RNA sequence: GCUGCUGUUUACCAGGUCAGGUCCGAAAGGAAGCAGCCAAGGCAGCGGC
């Protein structure tokens, strides 16, 4: 379960925007996304790092909700 | 080395285009620009000089 699957699942348009600005490797192995890449992603989707963190955070609770079934 | 071809590889860090999204604007319209792609570079094989 990666950020691509999470993508298949108003504010939702801006969530796609963020993911739509990452590279394939990033969508597949989310943990490689540190500070520098977050900056690229945020500006790339006209967002704020915090928005990105908020998304990665959600995908996290989401991913964690998967590693339990 | 230079050059042609082929395979492969490369998040951002003054290449082109730019889905999505963003910014400015009452609007008409403008601006920047990630991913992708093209290009370019890296690692090599073969050929030409």
UniProtKB/Swiss-Prot annotation:
Disulfide bonds: none
Superkingdom, taxonomy of origin: Bacteria
Deletion consequences: Essential; deletion experiments lead to loss of inner membrane protein targeting. Also leads to reduced targeting of lipoproteins Lpp and BRP.
Protein name (record): Signal recognition particle protein
Subunit details: Part of the signal recognition particle protein translocation system, which is composed of SRP and FtsY. SRP is a ribonucleoprotein composed of Ffh and a 4.5S RNA molecule. Metal ions are essential for the formation and stability of the SRP complex. Interacts with the ribosomes, via ribosomal protein L23. Interacts with FtsY.
Free-text comment on this protein's domains from its UniProt entry: Composed of three domains: the N-terminal N domain, which is responsible for interactions with the ribosome, the central G domain, which binds GTP, and the C-terminal M domain, which binds the RNA and the signal sequence of the RNC.
Function: Involved in targeting and insertion of nascent membrane proteins into the cytoplasmic membrane. Binds to the hydrophobic signal sequence of the ribosome-nascent chain (RNC) as it emerges from the ribosomes. The SRP-RNC complex is then targeted to the cytoplasmic membrane where it interacts with the SRP receptor FtsY. Interaction with FtsY leads to the transfer of the RNC complex to the Sec translocase for insertion into the membrane, the hydrolysis of GTP by both Ffh and FtsY, and the dissociation of the SRP-FtsY complex into the individual components.
Taxonomic placement: Bacteria, Pseudomonadati, Pseudomonadota, Gammaproteobacteria, Enterobacterales
Cellular localisation: Cytoplasm
Entry similarity comment: Belongs to the GTP-binding SRP family. SRP54 subfamily.
Residues of the full protein shown: 329 to 430 of 453
